[PDB]
Design a protein around this ligand. Structure first.
Ligand SMILES: N#Cc1cc(=O)[nH]c(=O)n1[C@@H]1O[C@H](COP(=O)(O)O)[C@@H](O)[C@H]1O
Ligand SMILES: N#Cc1cc(=O)[nH]c(=O)n1[C@@H]1O[C@H](COP(=O)(O)O)[C@@H](O)[C@H]1O
Lengths: 213, 214
């Protein structure tokens, strides 16, 4: 995936009008948009088609997939049918759940991102201790795309080590959760940014600002 | 929560027509339906309102919520606005992510179910070794409703031990994944059943048969 400006917009606004406006305003800067459940549960899967029609930006469905293999397969099918380029899947439910998603993505020609360690404080309780093994599981399964935390650069460094230079790594937690764009991009290929852009008075200026830095 | 016949239907059919037809066939037996992302992503969140209108069943949103606190809060907000009575939330992302869901549920008069240990084989890799501690975290947070695996009755037993007899416990993995209805109801208050009913030739007979076995 060639992410324009190394910057992925996390569009977690929950009404259609505002989400469309803000994404439109930053389209000169960003060609890849991460759409998750706050927007999808508010406006429907039809929102993915709408973004493709309006903007011709790649769409990553941030659905943190975390069910049994049979249900993960259905979720991936529904999400790729709607037009997502990629889906984010949790590794902590284990290898069979991840494989189920890889099998659908292989079949429909789309991508899986493996979420390895999360960026919020609570991630320290259980996920962090499992994360290096989760990332190594991903590599053994042939996963090529990963997600790891902007808020813990030492952990993001370790996860880049495990997955190698050829793997693709994107990282949330920049801005509102306290991660730095520059320090993150020493390990991640691209940064994910939501609130620092979408809650700005001038989203385009906020995006331009991050990019210029 | 009083689940009729201790049986919750997991409605994971992916089209509106089949989902409404199958649910209508078993409505005599079941007043609680677990609706997950397979149905919601195929048909929209309006399907929740439509089930309440047609059936008046309780709806548990099986969304395995597993994001950062701020995002979990927005998912719970959207879900309860859509008319879900309860939502399923993962414990593995930690206490702050579960507390975000509890906060919204409290504000809206809804219930959070904490998914401790999952029922599929992959659960053994990472989740199982954290599951007792996740359950203890639930107790510490004041969680009253939990989910644990029919496929590992000794783990389900341990979950019931940790949370005590006054917490409510529901359990998937019955039928298709190899769990036994009667054995699971030694420890769980209610069982979740999907494919054994909704893939049956006569779903009504499948549900009646299950209820008879218990
Ligand atoms: N993907 C993902 C996910 C995993 C993680 O560990 N940390 C996150 O912040 N996220 C998501 O990234 C986005 C971060 O947005 P923000 O820049 O903090 O506003 C949100 O959509 C959040 O749900
Ligand atoms: N809730 C939940 C979930 C957590 C888990 O550990 N195991 C499950 O099977 N489930 C869900 O319960 C249902 C079990 O359905 P079935 O009876 O195996 O067809 C599915 O909706 C599955 O996604």
């Amino acid at each position: 995936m060639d992410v324009m400006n190394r910057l992925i917009l996390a569009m977690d606004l929950m009404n259609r009008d505002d989400a469309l406006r803000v994404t439109g305003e930053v389209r000169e800067y960003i060609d890849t948009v991460k759409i998750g459940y706050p927007l999808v549960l508010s406006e429907g899967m039809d929102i993915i088609a709408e973004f493709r029609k309006r903007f011709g930006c790649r769409i990553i469905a941030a659905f943190a997939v975390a069910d049994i293999p049979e249900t993960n397969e259905k979720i991936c099918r529904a999400t790729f049918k709607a037009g997502a380029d990629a889906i984010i899947v949790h590794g902590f439910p284990g290898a069979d759940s991840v494989r189920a998603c890889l099998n659908v993505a292989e079949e429909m020609g789309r991508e899986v991102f493996l979420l390895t360690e999360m960026s919020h404080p609570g991630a320290e309780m259980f996920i962090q201790g499992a994360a290096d093994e989760i990332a190594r599981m991903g590599v053994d399964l042939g996963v090529k795309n990963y997600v790891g935390p902007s808020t813990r650069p030492e952990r993001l460094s370790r996860l880049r080590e495990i997955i190698g230079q050829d793997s693709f790594l994107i990282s949330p937690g920049v801005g509102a959760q306290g991660g730095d764009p520059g320090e993150t991009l020493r390990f991640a290929d691209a940064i994910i940014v939501g609130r620092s852009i979408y809650l700005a008075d001038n989203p385009a200026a906020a995006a331009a600002g991050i990019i210029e830095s």
